[PDB]
């Protein structure tokens, strides 16, 4: 009595006996190839923050650009597709003087994202005012009137009597989100050339600003004239530039801003909760896939394991292994 | 595949097949959590944290790779060991049916 075999050797590895030649094997791995990214099967995969917001970038949405507001769909899974997000309209920003470009990437790390419907503070009667709220032709609103970012209020002195230089003024930014949510407060400051600074604010020297929230302090000094070229903006010439920053207010805490002339006071504020699973990828998402792999894109789990470039991945994925593993499917080989 | 000398033992042949099938299914249905980015750590702002996160991913992938390799090695151990168990079970049947009048070589 006995057992038939293919009479051909195939080496496998065992736990206590080392390598053994057997009659047959089943390979357990493949090497994937690179292709486009896709929707993750079983999820709504977040690419753009507001896909219905047409002709808007993620940073446009994060700053509240006019015509770029609306609901941000929740998502348990998100794709980081811009290492350095850009704007595509509104008033010219000197982006790289702060961390502001990362704001939409910070937002996509949360599952739930929404812009507050209340103003966190009243801009017109803020310290150092009263102020009229500045608007710009670079930022056309729904009926094409002059507007501005919904997250901020351009504070311009309303009365010539108070149109003067000011000592640093402190404003408290309260927490207006729902308990459990993080609040991300967007603020900044406008600057211009020397004569336009005198006309707008009654002072043409550099202005200074600080923010402070949860023990995190920042400090900025403005620039008067000699600005870099306008970029990523509304395409309309402007003599001035704005600097924009964000501060994260955690666990229901109040933040503070100290400011002088040109302050962009916060208005609408981001409220975010939960956690979204994020990997790097590229748009557009084409079709669907079992798995999203940072190096291979969308892929489908044909076998339980894979060899090749290990990387961050999400979904129903094959597991990275070091060697092409083989399951034994036969008897011990003996030379015939 | 299993038999005597010619006739094939259907159940002994079949149960050897199922043993390899159970091992394949067991290895195919392992659940291992995946690795994604930190939601809070931003590029440029938190590069030092991101370097440690990359180190954590690299060490985790190596650990899981060794763990799955051992699982395959343990599966192959039981499969290769089962050949001797099947043969011994085939000899016990040729000794129970063939009475003591026969002698085993």
């Amino acid at each position, epitope marked *: 009595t006995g057992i038939t075999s293919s009479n051909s050797p195939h080496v496998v590895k065992t736990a206590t006996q080392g390598e053994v030649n057997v009659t047959g094997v089943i390979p357990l791995t493949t090497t994937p190839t690179k292709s486009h990214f896709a929707n993750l099967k079983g999820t709504e995969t977040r690419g753009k923050l507001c896909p219905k917001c047409l002709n808007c970038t993620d940073l446009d949405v994060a700053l509240g650009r006019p015509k770029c507001t609306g609901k941000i769909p929740s998502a348990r899974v998100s794709i980081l597709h811009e290492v350095r997000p850009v704007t595509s309209g509104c008033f010219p920003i000197m982006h790289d003087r702060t961390k502001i470009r990362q704001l939409p990437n910070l937002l996509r790390g949360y599952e739930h994202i929404r812009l507050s419907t209340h103003n966190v503070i009243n801009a017109e009667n803020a310290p150092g005012g009263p102020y009229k709220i500045g608007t710009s032709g670079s930022c056309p609103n729904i009926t094409n009137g002059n507007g501005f970012f919904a997250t901020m209020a351009w504070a311009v002195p309303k009365n010539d009597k108070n149109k003067t230089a000011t000592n640093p003024l402190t404003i408290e930014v309260p927490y207006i989100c729902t308990e459990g949510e993080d609040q991300i407060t967007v603020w900044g400051f406008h600057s211009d050339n020397e004569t336009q600074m005198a006309k707008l604010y009654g002072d043409s020297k550099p202005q200074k600003f600080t923010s402070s929230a949860n023990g995190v302090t920042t400090h900025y000094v403005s620039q008067i004239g000699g600005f870099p070229n306008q970029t990523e903006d509304g395409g309309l010439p402007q003599s001035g530039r704005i600097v924009v920053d964000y501060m994260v207010q955690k666990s229901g805490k109040t933040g503070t801003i100290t400011y002088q002339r040109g302050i962009l006071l916060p208005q609408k504020v981001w409220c975010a909760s939960g956690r979204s699973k994020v990997i790097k990828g590229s748009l557009p998402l084409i079709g669907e896939a079992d798995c999203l792999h940072e190096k291979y894109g969308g892929l*489908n789990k*044909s076998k339980p394991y894979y060899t090749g470039e290990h990387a961050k991945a999400i979904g129903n994925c094959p597991i990275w292994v070091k060697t092409p593993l083989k399951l034994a499917n036969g008897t011990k080989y003996r030379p015939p | 595949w299993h038999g005597y000398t010619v006739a094939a033992d259907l159940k002994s042949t079949q149960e050897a097949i199922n043993k390899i099938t159970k091992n394949l299914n067991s290895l195919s249905e392992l659940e291992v959590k995946n690795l994604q980015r930190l939601s809070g750590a931003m590029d440029e702002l938190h590069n030092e944290i991101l370097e440690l996160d990359e180190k954590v991913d690299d060490l985790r992938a190596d650990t899981i790779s060794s763990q799955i390799e051992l699982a395959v090695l343990l599966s192959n151990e039981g499969i290769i060991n089962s050949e001797d168990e099947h043969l011994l079970a085939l000899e016990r049947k040729l000794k129970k049916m063939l009475g003591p009048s026969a002698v085993e070589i």
Partner: nanobody
Amino acid sequence: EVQLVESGGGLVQPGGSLRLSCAATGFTLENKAIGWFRQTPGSEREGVLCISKSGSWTYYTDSMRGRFTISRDNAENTVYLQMDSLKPEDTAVYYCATTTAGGGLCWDGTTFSRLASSWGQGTQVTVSS
């Protein structure tokens, strides 16, 4: 008593399209992968396209990507192979196969064909003017 039954084959012109169906009796296709194969007379059976228990696709040969698509309907208990832009060389008997082994994954053509515990009787596709 379990059985797969292919249908939809027949004569079609080059550049034409044809939709084959793989219906199951005596068992359900849920949680199983279903792979399509084809065979030219005198040649070994070759893999075409498989759909996993999750509904995702695994192509068994590179050439057929694009032209061949696949879908499954758990209510209809049926898998469909959609063939477009057919060439004369696509003439063959087309088979579907399934199994409970391998975690409902598609594997590759060689391994899945060996894993298959059920094969349909095949349907003839003939591509000619």
